[PDB]
Amino acid sequence: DKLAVLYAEHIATLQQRTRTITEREGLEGLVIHSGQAKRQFLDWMYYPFKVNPQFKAWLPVIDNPHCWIVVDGASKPKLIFYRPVDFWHKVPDEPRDFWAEYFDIELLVQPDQVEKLLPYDKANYAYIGEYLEVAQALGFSIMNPEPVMNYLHFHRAYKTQYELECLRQANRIAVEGHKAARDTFFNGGSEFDIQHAYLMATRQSENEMPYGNIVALNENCAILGYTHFEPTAPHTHHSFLIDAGANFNGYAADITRTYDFKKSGEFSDLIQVMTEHQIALGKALKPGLLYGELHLECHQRVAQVLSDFNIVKLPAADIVERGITSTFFPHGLGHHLGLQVHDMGGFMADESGTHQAPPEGHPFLRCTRLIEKNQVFTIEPGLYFIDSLLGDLAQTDNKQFINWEKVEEFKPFGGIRIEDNIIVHEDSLENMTRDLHLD
Template sequence: MPDALAHLQMAHLEALERRYADAMSALGYDGVLIFSGRPALHFGDDQHANFCSYGHFQHWTGQAGLAHSWLLVQPGQHTTCFVHAPDDFWHLPPSLPDEGWTDYLEVISGRFETPPAVNASRLAVIGDVAEATARALGAECNPPALLTALDEGRVRKSEYEIACLSEANRMALRGHQAARAAFLAGESELDIQLAYLKASRQRESDVPYGNIVGLGAHGAVLHYQHYDSEAPASRHSLLVDAGYRYRGYCADITRSWPGPDADPAFAALVTRMHDIKQQLVAALAPGVDFVALHERMHRLLAALLVESELVAGSAEAAVEGGITRAFCPHGLGHLLGVQVHDVAGRTSREGIPLPPPPEHPALRLTRELEPGMTVTIEPGLYFIPMLLGPLQASPAGSDVNWSLVERLLPHGGIRIEDNVAIATHSVRNLTMEHE
């Protein structure tokens, strides 16, 4: 079958070659060798951990599972991918997909536990490479200025990358729909996870991050990492944060649903959190300061807390008193690409660090939005005892309706997350267009 994305991928690769050539020229390199990486052994064992190839290798190939492989970029020469595919009867050697990059790049298959020989007067090698390996090549290992330039080149996505992110969203939503159906059928977290994987056609080692499947109070654990095999007696709520990887590019979607045993107040909060997410998506545009947008999320959340009678007093006081931070301790979103938390979210295009404000240390994106960026928007509202305890003991705690909080604790929390591509005059919600 012809590759429908081949022409977009060709344009993507041509732009990559120009970008690498410009970075190498500016920094004085005539070659960059990218290592895909190697699986790590568990300590004291002969079993390997799940593997994912280096992001800059995936940026060219989209291959998340190619280990011990290399990609050589030299201006004026054919970019070459050295694919580690030895004869082996213990494991099936990798086979390459029918995609445009395999025609555009020179592909050489063989054994590459050690790097290929490179003829370059000044070579940089990047990835999980030992200094001794770089020295043997006469290369500089992971030079910071070059990495900063290459990271910046991943911030603005090509048409090809947006198409891949869109398809990843489409497939992830198939999983979310199946997860919701399993929840309403009374299944356990493990069964919901298996329903997600089956519907989205993934094995667990292929997902871009560990799926979060939290029933009830487990939804208040932001990175909940277990799957109970028994269904709870009461079905208050479900939070699913789960994605899909397509040609290296990641979807990162979260949905929350009230269950048959949900408090009506919780169901109303879920609806209103969808509204807040929509308002924040509508505010996206080039030039928007993401820190300011994150702060707007806190103002909208404060208004909701007052409206729902969780908090007395004004929305302004709820923000200033730190109440909203106790109900939502994470950032509004992050850059998205071949990594779920993609690179350069806290660094300007000039390489200047842009740390989050002290009151919002978890914010992963602190720069102004630009055309080509793809971001997540994920407002949240949680009932986390570890955070609510100190709030209750503080002066601001007197404004909180603790009896209502107590009713809502078994529901865990709410997170609504979409993936949105920023264009010059519009935004494209890659999640909602498939929902």
């Protein structure tokens, strides 16, 4: 209903984007390939299918390989829809959902017979997809041209009302998962149990997740890319960091929360001060501001915490200026969110693809684009006690300034990250995560 109505403006937006970039580049149209299933080496089984983001930008068809979109922004969008009729698969119903009527739909019963449906002379058609040797066999010469990709990726940061509603739906699902995971942690669950309570609440399997969930207990919290799920619980429950989202129509949620098992003590205090900073930074998104400036503020807030909690024996400014904050907060403040988890265009200054430079002391900041309305952001400040980086810091002049006893007291708890998904509007902010009352 609501989604069906908004979808028309979504097709209109993408039609106008196609017309603009195709005509600017002298192309008669785009051919966007959903992708193919990858077969495993020496085996008959396939890897799980992952749709081309450029394909699902047009319609919520994320589980169908060998599908093709032909668009020029002037004709009605043309869709080749893979629909095999083998007896060992449930034949799917011909496309009858809200997006069907916005396309002229040709059914494809076998992947290799796709050349009849594609354009005969395709010298002025750009193939957008991963399978370049399949494209060359079909007769395409232009493949993923950089001006077309950079244009599309740049305007991906401006979500249509259909996309906004999809991102809201994804946050509603993910938030239900986060609540069930929290409860499982406080009842003494293992990482594996917490993870599968999450999926049971989301009604989405491991491979439907938009990214590999991070479900960490105790010192695993300090491991940023922790992917394992330990099946047996730890003997003592201290902390819990879950980074997990959900999918809706190809769009992603991306939520992180950190919990203290005792819900009191110095680590519990650390979560709450970090929560204050996270809420404040999340309220600092505003059109016309460079995202890197929020990353700057975040480091100052982390330094204030390090100073106030006696983690570093320095006032806040010194901890920022000597670069010690990046030992405890080593990643960017956040990124754009949408069809991809770390969405496209976050580092661009213009639609040609020029990079927007990061701030002076953070050359690895990846999201530096100017904030505008209709853009969706993550805000994920963190403070971690990472053995590896603490080791680096002990080999510097800064070794004298860190309270090594107090850091040993926090190492069992690992670290903290608190992440929301916020829509930036013309004169307001919409925090999708906290409007669903997670906390």
